[PDB]
Amino acid sequence: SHMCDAFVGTWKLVSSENFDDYMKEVGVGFATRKVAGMAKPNMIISVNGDVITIKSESTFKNTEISFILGQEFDEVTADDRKVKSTITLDGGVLVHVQKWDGKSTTIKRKREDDKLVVECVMKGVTSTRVYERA
Ligand SMILES: S=c1[nH]nc(Cc2ccccc2)c(=S)[nH]1
């Protein structure tokens, strides 16, 4: 047993708050915001040795990242940003920092009760997205 066991599985989005405003702050344009804001993704998390894989799948976009904690990687986000990402575990929370064009956003993923809560922050704007097991 290990690091991220409680994150592993298949998760479905059940609620969202403030995601449009978060996307505005990130620089997402109108049409992408509308279509992405409609998405109801599933998030599929798996671990094999030191490698964590997170897939996001929706009618908008299917993405997949694989990474080792603490080890930077380049990521193309669903909204087509080219970012440099580092994901760490901080007191049981997965903390994902994305850097691009002098900007930064942080995505935190945590287990709370039977939920996986995703908090996305870009400057003063936070969006909270709640997932439940599929
Ligand atoms: S929690 C969650 N992760 N990833 C996506 C795709 C996405 C990422 C960044 C900006 C726009 C859309 C969604 S819709 N929800």
Separation of 36 CA from ligand 1 center, angstroms?
A: 7
Give the Cα separation of 109 and 118 in Å (integer): 5
Nearest CA to ligand 1 atom 8: 78
Give the Cα separation of 24 and 50 in Å (integer): 34
**Is 109 touching ligand 1 by the criterion CB < 6 Å?**
no
Separation of 74 CA from ligand 1 center, angstroms?
A: 17
Separation of 91 CA from ligand 1 center, angstroms?
A: 24
| DSSP one-letter code for 6 | G
Q: Give me the numbers of helices (H) and strands (E) for the chain, helices first please.
A: 2, 10
129 is in an annotated binding site: yes
> CB-hemisphere CA count at 13 Å for 119?
12
Give 58's contacts (C-beta < 8 A, 6+ positions apart). Answer: 39, 40, 41, 42
Residue in the structure block whose two tokens are 């702050």: 25
Residue 26, domain extent:
5-131
Q: How many domains does the chain have?
A: 1
- Way the structure was solved: X-ray
Helix (H, G, I), strand (E, B) or coil at 121: strand
CA angle 63, 69, 72 (to 5 degrees): 70
Give the Cα separation of 61 and 56 in Å (integer): 8
Identify residue 72 by its one-letter amino acid code. Answer: E
Domain at 90, CATH number: 2.40.128.20
26 is in an annotated binding site: no
